[PDB]
Amino acid sequence: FDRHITIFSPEGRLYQVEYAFKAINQGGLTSVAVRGKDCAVIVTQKKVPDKLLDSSTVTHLFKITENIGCVMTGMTADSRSQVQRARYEAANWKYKYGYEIPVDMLCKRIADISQVYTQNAEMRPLGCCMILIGIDEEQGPQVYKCDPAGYYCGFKATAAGVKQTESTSFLEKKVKKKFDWTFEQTVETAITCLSTVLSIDFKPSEIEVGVVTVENPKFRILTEAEIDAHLVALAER
Amino acid sequence: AGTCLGILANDGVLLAAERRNIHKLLDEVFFSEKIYKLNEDMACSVAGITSDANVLTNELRLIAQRYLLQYQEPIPCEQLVTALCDIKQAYTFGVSLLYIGWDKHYGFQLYQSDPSGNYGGWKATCIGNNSAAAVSMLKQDYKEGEMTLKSALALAIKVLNKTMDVSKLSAEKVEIATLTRENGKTVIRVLKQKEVEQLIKKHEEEEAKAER
Amino acid sequence: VEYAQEAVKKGSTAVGVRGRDIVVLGVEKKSVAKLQDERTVRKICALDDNVCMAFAGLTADARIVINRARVECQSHRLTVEDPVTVEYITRYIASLKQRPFGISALIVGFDFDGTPRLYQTDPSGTYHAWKANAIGRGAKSVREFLEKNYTDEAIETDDLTIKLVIKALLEVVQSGGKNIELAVMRRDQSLKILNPEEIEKYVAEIEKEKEE
Amino acid sequence: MFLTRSEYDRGVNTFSPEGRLFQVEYAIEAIKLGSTAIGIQTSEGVCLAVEKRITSPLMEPSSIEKIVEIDAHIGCAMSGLIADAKTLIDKARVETQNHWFTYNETMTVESVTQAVSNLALPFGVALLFGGVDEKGPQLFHMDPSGTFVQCDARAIGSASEGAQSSLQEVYHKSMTLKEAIKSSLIILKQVMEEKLNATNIELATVQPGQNFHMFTKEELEEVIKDI
Amino acid sequence: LLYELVSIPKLEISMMQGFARLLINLLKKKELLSRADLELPWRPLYDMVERILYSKTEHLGLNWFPNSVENILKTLVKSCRPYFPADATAEMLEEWRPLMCPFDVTMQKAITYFEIFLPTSLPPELHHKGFKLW
Amino acid sequence: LANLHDWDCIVQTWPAIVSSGLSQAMSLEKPSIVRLFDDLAEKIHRQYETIGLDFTIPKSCVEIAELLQQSKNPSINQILLSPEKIKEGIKRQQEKNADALRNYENLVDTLLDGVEQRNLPWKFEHIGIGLLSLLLRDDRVLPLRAIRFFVENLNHDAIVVRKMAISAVAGILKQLKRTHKKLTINPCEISGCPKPTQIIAGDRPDNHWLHYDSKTIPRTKKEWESSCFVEKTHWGYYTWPKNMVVYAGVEEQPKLGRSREDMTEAEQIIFDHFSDPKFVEQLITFLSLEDRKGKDKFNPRRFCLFKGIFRNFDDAFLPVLKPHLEHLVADSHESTQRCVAEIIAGLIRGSKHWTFEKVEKLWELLCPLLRTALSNITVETYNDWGACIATSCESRDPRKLHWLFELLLESPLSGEGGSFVDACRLYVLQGGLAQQEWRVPELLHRLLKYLEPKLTQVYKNVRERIGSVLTYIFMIDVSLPNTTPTISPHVPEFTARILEKLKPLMDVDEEIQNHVDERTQGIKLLK
Amino acid sequence: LVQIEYALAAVAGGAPSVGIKAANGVVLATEKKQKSILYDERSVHKVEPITKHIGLVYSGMGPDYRVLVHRARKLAQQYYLVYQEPIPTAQLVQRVASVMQEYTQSGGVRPFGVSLLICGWNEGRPYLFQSDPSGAYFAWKATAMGKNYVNGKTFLEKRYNEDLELEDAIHTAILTLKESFEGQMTEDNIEVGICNEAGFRRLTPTEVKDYLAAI
Ligand SMILES: O=P(O)(O)O[C@H]1[C@H](OP(=O)(O)O)[C@@H](OP(=O)(O)O)[C@H](OP(=O)(O)O)[C@@H](OP(=O)(O)O)[C@H]1OP(=O)(O)O
């Protein structure tokens, strides 16, 4: 009914697609991906509100293949569903086509699926954001992000969530000043960015970092001792 | 919008459409066409832009070709119109059609279908822009039962002179199709630029003679 | 249904009577336009070989009813080997829905043994048999004419049946002659759609019985 | 008189807060529109009377059927126009014949009424199945809701309740079939107020001996000779 | 001034609009004049409405009025009506009372002229020359 | 800026807006340019107001304006107005409404110069004629060349220009009408009765001479010239006016039958066109042509064309027209019967002011024409003769056109043609007796006396017309206050005779509804 | 339908696309501004090949656009399966506009918010076409799309001529974007594709940079 389903407004807008980005902000959580010379990291925060909850199960970092990882931001069940669909499309690319799916092709595929939600009126847009990282064989580190509108793009760095705009301002002042690279700095840039806009001076039980490197393209989820090894190195400077 | 004439004679039929371009750079290689051959012995013109025109025209061609596949004969002309008007009855295409044809049962023919699924046989008619002006100008001057293609082309350019909007009737702005029988074969001849020039200059010579 | 029934009353008057060895079925043929060809407007359509039908109402909706009944006459003839009863194809036409169509239909003809039948379908599907009936514009007054003049001695010969139909149409059809369309059957033969000359002869013998 | 509607009526598939489907309610109390039709079950057979309401004398009275033959032992009188009933009638005929094909026996009036009522699950036809089976003569009313019930006198149609209150009073268990036919004609003449002749009423009986039998014009006028 | 000048028998109706709109605006607040200050006649208003409401040449296409005229003259006469002479009712009832045949379209003319013109706000010292006369 | 108010801005703009059709930087092939000239011609015709040509402030407005420029509550001390420049004011105003005249007659001429300019597309001449159609004045007659133009394109090959020309030439014949003189009758000077006070409406003794009575129609030139002929159908029903106009006798009326040398030289153009066979055959060919099939009507615009023809010339054109309308009632076409109904209506209404010999010659013509035309009435045709006859006797004296009623109440319910012509001739007659309300008491009694034997004997489409006709028969018996009981048929007197006839249906034992004695005909009456 | 006009409202809000039909080819330049410096401009492409001889570009909604890029490429290759001949450009526009019309007839969906500029080269002869969200298609000499397309369509109507070469048509397609760019275009923030006899190709940014240096 022109603002209830995904049809055009008189000025050409899709209001349910606009409200899915409001729904991403409902989670309260901000994710940041930055990209280095031979590395691409994803950092999100790990606010665990209930203390008798198993914190090893609350995670927004997801393995898609061995070489491709993923941080999700938004409505959490929508996020797990879009992760299962990405895992399906990755395995089916490998089966049909005989090689591992590129990060741009997976992110393009998930955005192509999201367009269908934005165009058929009987289902809603799936109100969450996927950021895919992974190492391309010919292009190096790739950071791709698809939104509930069905857009995707490649990103020198990006952010998703509540403090997305200020994280974008931080990283945008950052990447025109330096060419941020090296394994250590790129985790530094993605920890400082999250910390600056949340302003809460991290302890490692509170964020979680996922990396890919060109030297080992396996998607790793950082150990809490390793987030300590970055937070101590960042917190004395 | 668009408009076209259709005039039945004793030795043939014609369609006489507009070629008016809405913008100075629309190419016209694509928009030049307005007459649509449907089979070996039948043609049509639409009231509308080229996209839904082709959607109607290819369905008409497909009905004519499956008739030819069944019977190895061309489809009789009222029967193709009946087939498409039965397609347009089930959809109640805001487009009207104007058919010229020849079949072995009924000779030269001139049909006109509406969007609602009806059709009618006419002896002269117009669909599209200034339709009522053209048929009111045509009902005066169409001589029933005694007109030839020379008088039919004269009526076509006389009616299009004072019903087309183009402000100077030239051969670049009119497509004329002429469907005659030549020694056992139907000839749908889209009548070309030099002959439309010769028929406009012969018309203008008659009006400038009657002005004296 | 009520929309479809008010579509009928606007339509042309159709009269059918059933005789001893003839069923006659006459429709007001109507001046359509001037440059219109009146061949395409039928209004009397043969269904099988022994079942004819006149309708009143929308001619786009009628044509699909005529086509479906005309296919099912042959399908019945292909599954059961015998011709349709007028009861059968009347019950099939009244069973047709689309909406209902928007026609009423007088369905005359002969069954295999040789019995004349006359049946009348409504848009609500509630057919029933008649000895004489009218549908269309002015139908109740023509039916009131026919509860006075349908006697045994007015239908006892073959020509007085045709003249009963003409006198019934000549109530509401005020052109007096040329503007009515007849069709008789005369069992085991065919339709015999009456000429404008034969209708004019019958009108002349009806008029000659009016100075007396 | 005036207008009394609420927010809970004419919702097509929606319960009211009192568990009621008022879209269906008003579409059952709009099938009173049919002409009156009285069936009476007696021990000598069941009788079925219905008024015919012929329009014109150019029209065959034998061409509008308000009592049909379902099988040789079951007749049915509908109220309403025939074209609404005719899928239920054809369903009943096909069900009797499939029951014969599989089982080599005549289907009971209750099972025919149940097989029609399954197809009625509205459909807007009140029917009166009268017939004779191994349980004697039986009459079954089936309202447009799909609810069927054996009843030993029943009037459906335009004046169903005013005729039903008369059927509550003339009927008794020891009633002969001729008394039932005379009583059904008296109540049809009462709810009709017209003169009673063989052009505005149909009548059919299903007896234990003979088959389904529609009265002819000569046999019908002998009944109204003493009404 | 703008009453004698809005009612000129062959005045241009186009610029009569402005004279009438001022003249409505000058008689709009009725409590400022008192019938002892103003006694505007009713006859040049009636000849004005006949020329423009029941025109004999507009339907033949010879006049072409502005579209908002009827609505601005029916209030222009409504404005001037509480200042008509006392005798006007009795001379509006010898001139439209002949038109009161209920079988044709001229009864409509009578009752439109009564609904526009016939005075209803007179003091009770002369109700007998107002509504108790019709 | 295209329809500003002055003359000096229309005389510039309208010839520019018609003459911009041959401009060579102009393209009607663009669909926005056609939309704007249709918007330009559409807006001007929607917003033109007639302009000027006379502004003369009388000696009542200047009297009350001197007092306003000498009031001294608030003032600037301004001098008394010199009569030298109360002369320059008249001087400037008399030459200001003189080039209003010059600009009007210039604008007409240069619209005419522009609308036929050697190669101009048909849009721009259809624009330039409608703009020219806005200039039918009524203060003046139209310019002689424009009279020539609108008369010569009655038969124009475009139907749009033909309808503009029909409207324009009806306006011309109204501009060119000669004023008919009126006298004053005392209505108790022809009736001879005291014309009582305590005003009573309805059929009175001073009202009675104005009723149609079948024993007092003139039938001679002497009883016609000595007769009153109150034309309107409302005068004297309620009360008489202060003075009452008569339409005085032919000896003082404008003389008719002029021989084209006496005509006013713009009557010359209409005479020299409407009197030759070639213009009339093209006019009636174009004017008997179908326009919108199924949607065509009586069109009172074309009735006003022929009412004005037979109101200014009246005698010489019907010998040119008699073969054309003699041919035209015999056609069983629809639009030919449309054409002759408009001509017959305007020819009957046009003969309002004629001599007895000339209306006598008119009705010797029109009686077989109307007999053939009502016998050949059709479903495509019946509500066009119902508009012809109701138009032809609206606002006319019933005694003057008594030939209509004798043609048309002779046998409306006769039987040739069967039903539906009994119903429609009794409908065409219905509008005729409907327009002549309260003033034809008998002939409504003649219709009631004719048609009470026929309520039983008639079909379904006719007793609907019988019912509508009995409604228009008993309209005049009103219970309106202070109304004298009418000479027209009384509705209680009739339905008592119905209640006599319908008595055997409402008695005891309640058996009804057979419709198959004095009972089934009672059912037929009750229908 | 009203959704077709509202879908054209989403086209006119999109970025400018300009396509010019030269004598020996067809250009298709578009507006490709990145919202910030964080976005890799190398990643996503607006000018897009359909065949080796047909490319296209859009204005409006990119995700709607990829749905018809995928289906134009499917219709093209299922033509090539049948005929083993590269599809004519006009035939492909009929197929694609039939697809783009299907989503206006069916309820429960919306139209595409995208309008395509299909270019082509077949039988030694270039083609410029525009498919609207209604499903209607028009052949063009030159046209604009997206934001202020009206002003672009009259800027083109002034600088278009028929004896125009492909390089000069690249020059006057950059200028039509530059009349509405808002802030100094570069080789990284526009995107041009050309058809010629050699087939369709999207110009490399090093090749766009020299065209921009020539202006
Ligand atoms: O003959 P009618 O159709 O009833 O028309 C008359 C006629 O006007 P036309 O001649 O222009 O049709 C009168 O003019 P005369 O014949 O008396 O010269 C005219 O009277 P005025 O010219 O004095 O106005 C009168 O108008 P009215 O009734 O207002 O007096 C008007 O009648 P309609 O108003 O019914 O047309």
| Distance between CA atoms of residues B4 and B14, nearest Å | 10
CA of E116 to the centre of ligand 1 (A): 24
Q: For position D22, which CATH number holds?
A: 3.60.20.10
**What CATH code is carried by the domain that includes residue C97?**
3.60.20.10
D21's CB contacts (< 8 A; 6+ apart) are D13, D14, D15
Separation CA A4–CA A27 (nearest Å) = 22
Question: CA Rg, chain E, in Å?
Answer: 15
Partners of chain F (3+ Cβ pairs below 8 A): B, C, D, E
Among protein residues, the one whose CA lies closest to atom 22 of ligand 1: F179
The shortest CB-CB distance from B25 to any of G97, G135, G140 is to: G140
Distinct helix (H) and strand (E) counts, chain G: 6, 11
F248: alpha, beta or left? (left if phi > 0; alpha if psi -120 to 50): beta
CATH of the domain at B39: 3.60.20.10
CA distance C209 to C203: 10
Is there a contact between D195 and F514 if contact means CB atoms under 8 Å apart? Answer: yes
**C119: left (phi > 0), else alpha (psi -120 to 50), else beta?**
beta
- Range of B178's domain? 3-211
Comparing CA positions, the residue from C140, C19, C11 lying closest to residue D56 is C140
Q: Reading across the β-sheet that carries D37-42, which strands appear in turn?
A: D153-156, D37-42, D45-51, D201-206, D212-214
- Give the relative orientation of helices C86-94 and C59-79 as an angle to the nearest 10 degrees: 130
Say if the Cβ atoms of F513 and D57 lie within 8 Å.
no
Pick from E49, E51, E55, E56 the residue to mutate for probing ligand 1's pocket: most ligand atoms within 8 Å of its CB: E56
Supply F476's token pair: 């005049």
Count CB-CB contacts under 10 A for residue D149.
Answer: 12
How wide is the angle at C-alpha C155 spanned by C-alphas C149 and C161, nearest 5°?
90
Q: How many domains does chain G have?
A: 1
Q: Are F149 and F270 in contact (CB under 8 A)?
A: no
> Could you tell me whether strands F483-484 and G17-21 are parallel, antiparallel, or unpaired per DSSP bridges?
unpaired
A64: domain CATH number is: 3.60.20.10
Closest CA to C102 of C139, C128, C64, C69: C64
Residues of F in contact with D57 (CB under 8 A): 516
**Tokens matching residue C157:** 């010969």
- Which CA distances in Å does G191 have to A6, B136, G181, G185, G209? 30, 55, 13, 11, 11
Domain housing A83: 1-237
- List of residues 6+ apart from D185 with CB closer than 8 A: D49, D196, D201, D203, D223, D224, D227
| Domain count of the fold of chain C | 1
Q: Cα–Cα distance between F385 and F345 in angstroms, integer?
A: 9
Positions of E strands within chain B = 3-8, 13-18, 36-39, 42-46, 97-103, 107-113, 119-122, 124-128, 174-182, 185-191
Ligand 1 center–CA F345 separation, angstroms: 16
- Residues E117, G81: Cα–Cα separation, whole Å: 87
Q: CA-CA distances (angstroms) from residue D98 to C79, D67, D95, D140?
A: 21, 22, 5, 20
Domain count, chain B: 1
- Check residue C150 and report its DSSP letter: -
Residue identified by tokens 């023509």 is C142
Compute, in angstroms, the gap from residue F172 CA to the centroid of ligand 1: 15
Give DSSP secondary structure letters for F74-98: S----PPPPTTTTTHHHHHHHHHTT
Number of domains in chain A: 1
Residues of chain B contacting residue F26, judged by C-beta atoms under 8 Å apart = 167
CA atoms of F356 and B56, how far apart (whole Å): 68
Nearest to F15 by CA among F79, F105, F155, F109: F109
> Domain span at residue C97?
1-212
The backbone region for B145, taken as left when phi is positive above 0, alpha when psi lies in -120 to 50, beta otherwise, is left
- Cα of A178 vs its chain's centroid, Å: 22
Domain CATH code at residue G139: 3.60.20.10
Query: Which atom, in ligand 1's list, is nearest to the CA of F395?
Result: 4
Which residues in chain B have Cβ-Cβ distances shorter than 8 Å to G140? Answer: 25-27
Distance F309 CA to ligand 1 centre (A): 15
Determine the Cα–Cα distance for residues C63 and C101; give it in Å rounded to an integer: 10
Other C-beta atoms lying within 10 Å of the C-beta of residue C200: 12
Q: Is G37 helix (H, G, I), strand (E, B) or coil?
A: coil
B61: Cβ contacts below 8 Å, ≥ 6 apart = B38, B39
Reading the block at residue F341, the tokens are 């109904």
Atom of ligand 1 nearest to the CA of F247: 17
Residue G35 touches chain A, beta carbons under 8 Å: no
Residues 6 or more apart from C117 whose CB is under 8 A from it? C18, C23, C85, C86, C87, C107, C108, C109, C110, C111, C129
Contacts of G44 (CB under 8 A, 6+ apart): A152, A153, A154, G62
DSSP class per residue in G76-117 = HHHHHHHHSSPPPHHHHHHHHHHHHHHHHHSTTB---SEEEE
F516 in contact with D, Cβ within 8 Å: yes
Task: Count interface pairs B-F at CB distance under 8 A.
Answer: 46
Cβ(D49)–Cβ(D196) below 8 Å:
no
Cα–Cα distance measured from residue E93 to residue E129, given in angstroms and rounded to the nearest whole number: 11
Inter-residue long-range contacts of F472-475, CB under 8 Å, 24+ positions, other chains counted: F472/F430, F472/F433, F472/F434, F473/F433, F473/F444, F473/F447, F473/F448, F475/E103, F475/F437
Contact B162, F157 (CB under 8 A): yes
Candidates G2, G8, G38, G110: best to mutate against A (most CBs of A within 10 A) is: G38
Residues C30, C28: Cα–Cα separation, whole Å: 6
Q: How many CB pairs under 8 A join E and F?
A: 96
**What is the domain extent for residue D87?**
1-227
CA distance C131 to chain D (A): 5
Q: Indicate the DSSP class of residue G122.
A: -
Task: Using alpha carbons only, give the angle C157, C163, C167 rounded to the nearest 5 degrees.
Answer: 145
Which residues does a 6 A CB cutoff place in the pocket of ligand 1?
Answer: E 56; F 174, 177, 179-180, 311, 349, 352, 395
- Domains identified in chain D, total number: 1
Nearest-CA neighbor of F158 among B130, D117, B82? B130
- Tell me which chains share at least 3 CB pairs under 8 Å with chain E: F
Would you tell me the crossing angle of helices F317-326 and F356-375 to the nearest 10 degrees? 10
Name the residue facing G136 among B28, B30, B51 (closest C-beta). Answer: B51
**Chain B: residue whose CA lies nearest to G140:** B26
Chain E residues within 8 A of F240 when measuring between CB atoms: 98
Q: Which chain F residues have a beta carbon less than 8 Å from that of C173?
A: 379
Residue nearest to atom 25 of ligand 1 (CA): E56
Q: What number does the ligand 1 atom closest to the CA of F174 have?
A: 11
